[PDB]
Amino acid sequence: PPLPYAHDALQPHISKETLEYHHDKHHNTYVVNLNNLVPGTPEFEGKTLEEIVKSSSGGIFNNAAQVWNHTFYWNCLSPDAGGQPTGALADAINAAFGSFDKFKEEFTKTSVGTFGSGWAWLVKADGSLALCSTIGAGAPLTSGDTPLLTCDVWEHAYYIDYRNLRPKYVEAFWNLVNWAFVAEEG
Amino acid sequence: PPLPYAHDALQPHISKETLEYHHDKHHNTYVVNLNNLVPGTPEFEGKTLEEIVKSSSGGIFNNAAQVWNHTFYWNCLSPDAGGQPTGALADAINAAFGSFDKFKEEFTKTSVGTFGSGWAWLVKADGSLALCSTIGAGAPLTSGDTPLLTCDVWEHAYYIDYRNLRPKYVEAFWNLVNWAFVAEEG
Ligand SMILES: [Fe+3]
Ligand SMILES: [Fe+3]
């Protein structure tokens, strides 16, 4: 039942049509985890969203999963954005992937190539793993790991390209900042 | 090896840049099939129509399923509208789905309720009722039902309506294939 957003608005090249339609795809609906849900019919009452995954129902009560995934997404982004360094996480990826061009050109067979909707992610169990999970009802926080970066590849995460749309993750999304917010290592 | 369509990209309920993109999402995009068919082996070299759905274990391979769900659908929408099943077809619904008024308002459910990408399908086995197929390239053909009334619920199914799936289908898509070959002869 939150009201995320800030840092962005017009966020360079991913529009305000797409963004405050999409920021609302997440918080008009999704923030639906409550109505004839939490309080409403399927239970859980005292939870943190963080606490929804692991314990909770299924897909219907995994719209609550959508809220986390999205307000996560929104803090993983651009508008002052760029490419890794600033420490060990640099060095992490650089020996797991081995490189970053490599990292960015692998983290796609994550994203691009997953039949349907969901999100690709940068994850860490106790060292890094690039995890598929494209179903919506996929947050690697169900298991023994926690996400460094996400990307909604659900068809409305984008559209501003339409006949031929990969340049969405590429020629649209690698102007991702919060390499400072993705900086996570433990 | 598909190149056809029942009419030209619409006009009044489903745009021209719906039928452009959706039909080629279908086309030169779902060309993934032909890429991994005879080429190496699978046992899918031969096997009639999409007998590759029934045998097939998908995603990239259950592309077969997707060629099909899309070609199924094509026939399902026609400029010739009339949410009026004659009364041969009318019978098998005006006894199952309450009535037809009550079939539609029940096909809504399954269609909007298919959580992110998927379908709402009207089948027949030798036990009758509707169907929600929420996992991607779906299809009732592995289960073995065999009339079919399609739809498409993927977000690419609507550049029109934006987030408004229902206005799109429980609205717009009551322009079903004149219940003649929806009307069953097999
Ligand atoms: Fe989204
Ligand atoms: Fe489709």
UniProtKB/Swiss-Prot annotation, chains A, B:
EC numbers, comma separated: 1.15.1.1
Source organism superkingdom: Bacteria
Cofactor: Fe(3+)
Alphabetical list of InterPro entries matching this protein: Mn/Fe_SOD (IPR001189), Mn/Fe_SOD_BS (IPR019833), Mn/Fe_SOD_C (IPR019832), Mn/Fe_SOD_N (IPR019831), Mn/Fe_SOD_N_sf (IPR036324), SOD_C_sf (IPR036314)
Cofactor note: Binds 1 Fe (3+) cation per subunit.
Keywords: Iron, Metal-binding, Oxidoreductase
Signal peptide: none
GO molecular function: metal ion binding; superoxide dismutase activity
Binding site for Fe(3+): 22, 70, 152, 156
Pfam families, alphabetized: Sod_Fe_C, Sod_Fe_N
Catalysed conversion reaction: 2 superoxide + 2 H(+) = H2O2 + O2
Functional note: Destroys superoxide anion radicals which are normally produced within the cells and which are toxic to biological systems.
Family: Belongs to the iron/manganese superoxide dismutase family.
Subunit composition and interactions: Homodimer.
Record protein name field: Superoxide dismutase [Fe]
Organism: Pseudomonas putida
